[PDB]
């Protein structure tokens, strides 16, 4: 196994996958690392198994069809993994916890949103369709763009949104276009 957490790249108390070399902190893995389960398989492995069981799941899809899917177990897992892929980027720190807004010339967003809120919402099964999860994720970055305006800090929202979007297209096998 690896000697650092796959998500945050730090050592510490790690849980090791039994079917690949990755390791995780307890609350870095999504879902949080399961109490027992021997052997234990991480989310990367669980996602790889879905693909292997249904190879045609990698054929191209339309985003509109994906967003309307109900959050059955496999869609729940894919949203978990997509959220995890965002936390894997160190720039996710800016978007993890509950923000506050007091900048001369700007007003805070009507609907604040942050990664740990989306994490909670997933854990509590609050999304009935994929669309709920993707809307809240895209709202994080949109709120950041609107608030920071012409400050160059706006770029952090662009950067982390790009990671989100690339991974959304990968995980849900969105049809490639020009
Ligand atoms: Zn970690
Ligand atoms: Zn694994
Ligand atoms: Zn099949």
């Amino acid at each position: 196994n690896s000697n650092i957490c796959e998500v945050c790249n730090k050592w510490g108390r790690l849980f090791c996958c039994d079917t690949c070399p990755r390791s995780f902190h307890e609350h870095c893995h999504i879902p949080s690392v399961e109490a027992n389960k021997n052997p234990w398989s991480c989310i990367f492995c669980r996602i790889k198994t879905i693909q292997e069981r249904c190879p045609e799941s990698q054929s191209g899809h339309q985003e509109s069809e994906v967003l309307m899917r109900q959050m059955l177990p496999e869609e729940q897992l894919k949203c978990e993994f997509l959220l995890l892929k965002v936390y894997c980027d160190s720039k996710s720190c800016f978007f993890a916890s509950e923000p506050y807004y007091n900048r001369e010339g700007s007003q805070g967003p009507q609907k604040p949103m942050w990664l740990n809120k989306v994490k909670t919402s997933l854990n509590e099964q609050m999304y009935t369709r994929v669309e709920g999860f993707v809307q809240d994720m895209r709202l994080i970055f949109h709120n950041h763009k609107e608030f920071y305006r012409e400050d160059k800090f706006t770029r952090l929202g662009i950067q982390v949104q790009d990671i989100f979007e690339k991974n959304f297209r990968n995980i849900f096998a969105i049809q490639e276009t020009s």
Side-chain angles (χ1 to χ4, degrees), residues 1-36 38-178:
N1 284 94
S2 193
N3 317 324
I4 57 179
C5 180
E6 190 76 359
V7 183
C8 73
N9 296 108
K10 296 294 196 290
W11 181 71
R13 181 50 188 128
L14 300 175
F15 300 81
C16 280
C17 188
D18 293 309
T19 55
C20 78
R22 301 180 175 92
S23 313
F24 306 85
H25 298 97
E26 178 175 1
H27 299 312
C28 285
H29 195 270
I30 307 179
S32 288
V33 181
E34 294 83 5
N36 202 281
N38 308 51
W40 179 74
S41 262
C42 81
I43 194 166
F44 291 82
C45 289
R46 298 169 65 195
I47 291 281
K48 193 211 294 307
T49 297
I50 304 314
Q51 285 169 20
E52 285 175 2
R53 289 182 170 160
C54 295
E56 69 273 32
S57 71
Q58 298 157 274
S59 297
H61 302 75
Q62 289 307 104
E63 175 171 319
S64 58
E65 177 266 320
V66 165
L67 298 184
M68 290 310 311
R69 299 184 188 163
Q70 294 176 15
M71 288 281 257
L72 288 183
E74 297 196 333
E75 306 313 299
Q76 176 78 31
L77 189 70
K78 284 175 172 204
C79 294
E80 295 163 344
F81 187 50
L82 177 50
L83 181 55
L84 177 142
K85 283 284 189 157
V86 176
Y87 285 96
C88 291
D89 197 283
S90 66
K91 293 160 178 285
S92 67
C93 70
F94 296 115
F95 302 107
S97 77
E98 185 170 10
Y100 64 90
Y101 300 97
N102 191 8
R103 182 198 192 241
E104 191 187 318
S106 287
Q107 277 290 332
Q110 301 304 323
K111 187 180 174 184
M113 190 51 58
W114 57 100
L115 295 168
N116 293 343
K117 193 173 167 63
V118 177
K119 183 177 280 191
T120 293
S121 295
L122 271 178
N123 183 233
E124 290 179 353
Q125 295 159 312
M126 295 291 302
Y127 298 113
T128 59
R129 292 172 194 270
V130 174
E131 179 173 56
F133 164 81
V134 169
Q135 285 172 347
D136 281 349
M137 295 291 292
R138 289 178 168 163
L139 182 62
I140 301 171
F141 312 119
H142 190 259
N143 280 351
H144 176 100
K145 279 159 97 153
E146 297 298 279
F147 185 72
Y148 292 104
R149 303 284 199 123
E150 307 295 301
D151 193 298
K152 71 205 168 155
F153 195 55
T154 55
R155 181 160 177 258
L156 275 291
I158 295 159
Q159 289 176 326
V160 177
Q161 186 159 9
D162 193 41
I163 297 296
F164 172 74
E165 297 296 343
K166 282 181 194 286
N167 282 281
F168 171 67
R169 295 195 300 272
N170 181 259
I171 291 164
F172 289 91
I174 297 293
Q175 171 61 52
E176 290 274 298
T177 47
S178 60

